[PDB]
Write a protein that binds this DNA or RNA. Structure first.
Lengths: 135, 97, 87, 50, 206, 120, 60, 119
RNA sequence: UUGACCUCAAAUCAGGUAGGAGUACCCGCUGAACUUAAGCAUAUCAAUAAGCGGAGGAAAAGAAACCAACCGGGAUUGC
RNA sequence: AUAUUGGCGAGAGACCGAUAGCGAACAAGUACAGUGAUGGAAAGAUGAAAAGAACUUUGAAAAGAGAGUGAAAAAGUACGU
RNA sequence: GUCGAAUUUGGGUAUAGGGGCGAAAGACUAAUCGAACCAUCUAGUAGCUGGUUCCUGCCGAAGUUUCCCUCAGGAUAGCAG
RNA sequence: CGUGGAGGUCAGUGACGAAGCCUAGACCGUAAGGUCGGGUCGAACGGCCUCUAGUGCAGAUCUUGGUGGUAGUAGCAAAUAUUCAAAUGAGAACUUUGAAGACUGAAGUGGGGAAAGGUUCCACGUCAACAGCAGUUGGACGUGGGUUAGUCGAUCCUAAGAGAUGGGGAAGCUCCGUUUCAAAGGCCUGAUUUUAUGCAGGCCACCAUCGAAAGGGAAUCCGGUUAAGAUUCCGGAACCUGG
RNA sequence: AAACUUUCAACAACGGAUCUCUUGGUUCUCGCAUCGAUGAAGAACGCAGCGAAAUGCGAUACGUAAUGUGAAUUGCAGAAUUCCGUGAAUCAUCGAAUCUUUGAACGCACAUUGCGCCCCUUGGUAUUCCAGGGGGCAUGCCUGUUUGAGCGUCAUUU
């Protein structure tokens, strides 16, 4: 789990958020796997990942990456989309399979808090829209 | 605070509502800016009808049954009934759902 | 004396000229400039200080490259030479 | 400070060049609004702080 | 929104024989120790700073809007109301004024103006070109430098070029029957306007 | 009235574009406009010019130097003498001037026809 | 005495002067002037004198 | 007026190199007499002549270097056009316009047609 | 002893790429308190401000493991 | 199709008019203070054109009195009113 | 008072904010500390003091009821326009 | 009633002169205020029917700026010190020179430096400003000149300590350690005669870097010389390192 | 009665208010998509005949090359006649170059303008010493090439 980095356990707040040792983080270990690997080799692009093994202390993953600067991927237009600059650091913005699941973007009434982006839906629904002609 | 005879108003203006206020001064300016987009489309889209033709399809739910609205496409049964194949409607400018 | 007599015992230097911004914020003992950060690989700029950021953003120097970028795109990034039209 | 460094001296040499008043021609220029050297620096009233 | 609030000041409290308004920190600049924030200070924010979401435009009932315009159209007739806004039409055979539709198909300004002066609108034209004074307000250097009176207005059913033949001469304005702007038929909320009708336009009014 | 959406009518920009403008205007006489079919030309350093407005009205001369900082020209003979004995030229704005003799080497020999002229 | 370039050193002073004025150098002493320039004292050998060399280039 | 621009273009490579020392020496002479009297505006008009000849050497010298690399790939980096970093990266027009086998077969077989309504 | 496979490496090997800046909009992580409750511990402020990682001219979402139960509709986005 | 006090290029206003309006209409993130993170101002309008005062006299001079320039210096640079 | 020593001190270095260091006095932490400085939230909240910018005409009060962790406050009724 | 601006109107006023300001001068209104005459002054402004608001002032230990009485007052009283003559100068209790009288009494009121200052150093001319008196005097003003190193130091070594790799944490800005779970290096002989330097053996294993111009450290002194430099320049006489 | 205090007016002082102007700010709206290892943003230092500052620039230093306009700049000095013509201009445009020391900072370092290594070349009686000139040596990672390591391990004669 994700223990708070607060020093000596002090939280300096209301007695509501006084817990340190029992917080669970908001992204899967799979997302951290892409982050630590997609950052070591910046010349590559993270495509996907999957579970391979595990133990009491670690969770093992093998990440598949593509090279957009390689001429093989530059041609063979099936995979040209990975060469576009808009796909730079896809996993950093949570655009992978685990990314789209960790932030929970899916179709259905079960996903209304996060259906088009948690912040964007909040701002869209929490705002005052004033027209020129006040009806 | 409250007093006298008034309705009990609940105004949701407790957050920092001022930093997010989308005023719509443009409106008419955007209206002209969208006429330009529509006008320029009519030229480079060839002498085409612009919008496609949408099916006549019944509205859902209980209240909206007396009226019939426009759908998104002609399925495949109607497309096959017309004789033309599925993908030929898209080229000829008929939407398929 | 905590006042005037203790203000004459100060003849050392804590900070010195920063080799990256020259603002004399390079702490000697800490080896870290307090204004931009050095030899850190990133210039420190916090959103809680807005006047400080406004003092070092683009536009406070010379823009030796970006004064021409708008002009270069202003035509379309041409290359080569020019022709002779008349006169 | 006697046993100086070239980095410090290069800054002091810059200060010596700029420690001058306006040449008289400046005041006679067309549409001139400058009448004094507002950047004047002296070793008594102000300190350079290197 | 950041005006006056860029200066970071804290109140000095009590015990220093000064006003407890926020005093800025630091020293050696002449601004240090001065007032800030409060509207009583120098350089501080104005009281309740004006904000963009004021009600600039105000809605009007569509039927009511057509009612005042219809009333304004009736004000174009009746000689007494016309003279109440200048509009020197004292020498005119009758009101309303009806002109042939050929005025719509006039192309030259020189012939266009001569057409109005032949009818008798010359005095209204002559009323303009003498009132071109400056503006008393400070807005005279806010792109509102010059002001004139309002000359005769021309109502035409089908455009044939009259709009460009009168858009340069001062005071004269052109408007179709469809538009019939109320801001033109009763400027300054005063009834009565010297509107020049045409055969085609006067028949389409009904 | 202004019709295009590219030219400003604001006083602030109009005056700004005038004072802070780079280096890059007098009309001609009745005979020149009846001989060359052109109304206005830029001013040069070798032009004969006659004054039509101002106190020194009617005194003709040749421009000694077009002084583009004051936005005015200096006629050689039209001058006023200082008290101590020296004399200094007085600035003249070319719009209040009338050119009678031109100086056309090859370019002014070309500007005439481009503006619907017929030269000599 | 010359206002030599800042980047130059006594190795590059002893050779540049002897290529222009065809006179050898006994020794070079160089200091940095407090105005932002560099000064260099060039003492030629006894086989030449600076008087007829200073004026022939123009300054005397 | 110093030197002109296009007159020394026709000059040979060796002759231009010797032109520098001709200008370079007289600069050393103009410094010597500039201190003698407090007026010498002629130094500016020919210090712009030493720069012009230096510029012409580079434009002639780069052309020979460029002609050596014509026809073959991997030319020197500065010879390559600058653009911007993003434009130099990403996909070339051939790479972007390339299409797969299956999608191309659909394209020729079923293009988008043009039509209208008359009756 | 020779010749192949797999794994790990070496070089100022050939060719490439990434770091920083700006962040007004956009994608996430982390994350308070003043304050409201005319006290204060849930609550509200707030899934905010500060801090961190990441891009583009837009970003995101996007052809349903959808909404509905209705004579059913039919990618996403915004009013 | 949506947003965009950042960058470029423009058009505007029942906005402010220089103790207001951006901190800055001016050599303004400038002078300056702090060892530091940081804080941070004051300052527009002589005249159309310097024609900004030759020359006489007094005084050591600074300046004064004349003269003169300029419609007007009860416009003389510590200069609109 | 002490003065060749649990002496005095220069330079480098280490320890930092509810944290350092303390032969302890809640002492020192760059004139500030039983709890540092700077910027942001922040124009923090106040039942508590002060101020709250022209004329004339007409009408014109209350410190009382009930309730409230309510008694230097509100709500209700009253007086008043 | 009045103030900043907006629509309309009076073809309103105005450089033979608007606005603004002064005026124990006049008129109107109970009053908010309005009108006129005179002086000053030079570019715009006013009445009316409406609209709009950053619209009125005596004080809030109110913001900014300026000026008063106090007041020509308090005071310019520590460090035992002044006097005469001449010179310069329009202008000497203070500048210079000369003659006296004193003081610091060499743990200096003397000679050099470290940190710090940055041209204050020296020369010419000069007094509007600073030197809380004055001043032809200055650490002030305007213009110039001046700092010479194989040997003096920085350069190099390392102390307390800082910190980069390999690694391990941390969402992360970055944190731990720095020889620890890293296969981490160059190096003399020989080959020579395409071997340029490769190649065949003997080999050693330390194991980034920074960190103390009073810690360790290779080597020089004397005489003389500028307005201002010297263990640096001139002369003479040395020693060390690399080749 | 004077001096002195107070009030008013005339003039003259300190002072900067009032009116009028602005080669500014603020807000809205319509368009565009152009930072950086081909080494940016920023910083230091220097460049003009006579300038400190702003501005421009980088010993090619208020800048060079090219195109267009077309006879100037200006405070002075100076240079001109290049001005009926591949030519002025503190002009405009800008498609070619230069672009100091730095800076993500790139050989290692950096409150020491310190210390290194490799290649080419020149000089100093010199592959091994010194100096001058020119060009290189940062890390993570991708593809390929070349050298290797591993009874991890496979066939083959011994």
């Amino acid at each position: 789990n994700r223990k708070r980095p607060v020093p000596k356990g002090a939280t300096y707040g209301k007695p509501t958020n006084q817990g340190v040792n029992e917080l669970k983080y908001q992204r899967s270990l799979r997302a951290t796997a892409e982050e630590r690997v997609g950052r070591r080799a910046a010349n590559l692009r993270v495509l996907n990942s999957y579970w391979v093994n595990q133990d009491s202390t670690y969770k093992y993953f093998e990440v598949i990456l593509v090279d957009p600067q390689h001429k093989a991927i530059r041609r063979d237009a099936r995979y040209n989309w990975i060469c576009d600059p808009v796909h730079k650091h896809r996993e950093a913005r949570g655009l992978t399979a685990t990314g789209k699941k960790s932030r929970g973007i899916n179709k259905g009434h079960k996903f209304n808090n996060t259906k088009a982006g948690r912040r964007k839906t909040w701002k869209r629904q929490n705002t005052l829209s004033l027209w020129r002609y006040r009806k | 605070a409250i007093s006298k005879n008034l309705p009990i108003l609940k105004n949701h203006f407790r957050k920092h509502w001022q930093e997010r206020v989308k005023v719509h001064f443009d409106q008419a300016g955007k209206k002209v800016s969208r006429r330009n987009a529509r006008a320029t489309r009519a030229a480079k889209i060839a002498p085409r009808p612009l919008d496609l033709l949408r099916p006549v399809v019944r509205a859902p739910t209980v209240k909206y049954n007396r009226k019939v609205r426009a759908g998104r496409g002609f399925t495949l049964a109607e497309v096959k009934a017309a004789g033309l194949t599925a993908a030929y409607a898209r080229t000829i400018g008929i939407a398929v759902d | 004396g905590k006042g005037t007599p203790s203000f004459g015992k100060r003849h050392n230097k804590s900070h010195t000229l920063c080799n990256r911004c020259g603002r004399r914020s390079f702490h000697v003992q800490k080896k870290t400039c307090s204004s931009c950060g050095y030899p850190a690989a990133k210039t420190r700029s916090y959103n809680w200080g807005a006047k400080a950021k406004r003092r070092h953003t683009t536009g406070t120097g010379r823009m030796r490259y970006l004064k021409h970028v708008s002009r270069r795109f202003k035509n379309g990034f041409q290359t080569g030479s020019a022709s002779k039209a008349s006169a | 400070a006697a046993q100086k460094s070239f980095r410090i001296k290069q800054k002091m040499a810059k200060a010596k060049k700029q420690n001058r008043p306006l040449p008289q021609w400046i005041r006679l220029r067309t549409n001139n609004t400058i009448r004094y050297n507002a950047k004047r620096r002296n070793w008594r009233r102000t300190k350079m702080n290197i | 929104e950041k005006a006056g609030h860029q200066t970071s000041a804290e109140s000095w409290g009590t015990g220093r024989a000064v006003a407890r308004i926020p005093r800025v920190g630091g020293g050696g600049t002449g601004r240090s120790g001065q007032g800030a924030f409060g509207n009583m200070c120098r350089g501080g924010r104005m009281f309740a700073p004006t904000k963009t979401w004021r009600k600039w435009n105000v809605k009007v009932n569509h039927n009511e809007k057509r009612y005042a315009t219809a009333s304004a159209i009736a004000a174009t007739a009746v000689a007494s109301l016309v003279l109440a806004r200048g509009h020197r039409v004292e020498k005119i055979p009758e009101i309303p004024l009806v002109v042939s539709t050929d005025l719509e198909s006039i192309q030259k300004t020189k012939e266009a103006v001569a057409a109005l002066k032949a009818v008798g609108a010359h005095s209204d034209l002559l009323k303009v070109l003498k009132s071109k004074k400056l503006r008393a307000g400070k807005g005279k250097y806010r792109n509102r430098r010059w002001t004139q009176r309002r000359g005769p207005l021309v109502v035409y059913a089908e455009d044939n070029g009259i709009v460009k033949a009168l858009r340069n001469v001062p005071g004269v304005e052109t408007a179709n029957v469809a538009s019939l702007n109320l801001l033109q038929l009763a400027p300054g909320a005063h009834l009565g306007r010297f509107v020049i009708w045409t055969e085609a336009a006067f028949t389409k009014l009904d | 009235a202004k019709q295009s959406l590219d030219v400003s009518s604001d006083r602030r920009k109009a005056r700004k574009a005038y004072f802070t403008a780079p280096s890059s205007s007098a009309p001609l006489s009745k005979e020149l406009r009846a001989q060359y079919g052109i109304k206005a030309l830029p001013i040069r350093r070798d032009d004969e010019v006659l004054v039509v407005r101002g106190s020194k009205k009617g005194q003709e001369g040749k421009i000694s130097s077009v002084y583009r900082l004051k936005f005015a020209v200096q006629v050689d003979k039209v001058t006023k003498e200082k008290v101590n004995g020296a004399s200094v030229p007085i600035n003249l704005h070319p719009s209040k001037l009338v050119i009678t003799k031109l100086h056309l080497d090859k370019d002014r020999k070309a500007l005439i026809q481009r503006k619907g002229g017929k030269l000599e | 005495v010359f206002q030599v370039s800042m980047k130059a050193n006594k190795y590059q002073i002893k050779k540049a002067v002897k290529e222009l004025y065809e006179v050898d150098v006994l020794k070079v002493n160089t200091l940095v002037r407090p105005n932002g320039t560099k000064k260099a004292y060039v003492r030629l050998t006894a086989d030449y004198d600076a008087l007829d060399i200073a004026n022939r280039i123009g300054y005397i | 007026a110093g030197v002109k621009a296009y007159e020394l273009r026709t000059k040979s490579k060796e002759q231009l190199a010797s032109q520098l020392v001709d200008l370079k020496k007289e600069l050393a002479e103009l410094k010597v007499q500039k201190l003698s009297r407090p007026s010498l505006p002629k130094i500016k008009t020919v210090r712009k002549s030493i720069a012009c000849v230096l510029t012409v050497i580079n434009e002639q010298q780069r052309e020979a270097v460029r002609q050596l690399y014509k026809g073959k790939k991997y030319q020197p980096k500065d010879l390559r056009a600058k653009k911007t970093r993003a434009l130099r990266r990403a996909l070339t027009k051939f790479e972007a316009s390339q299409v797969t086998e299956k999608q191309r077969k659909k394209q020729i077989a079923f293009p988008q047609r043009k039509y209208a309504i008359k009756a």
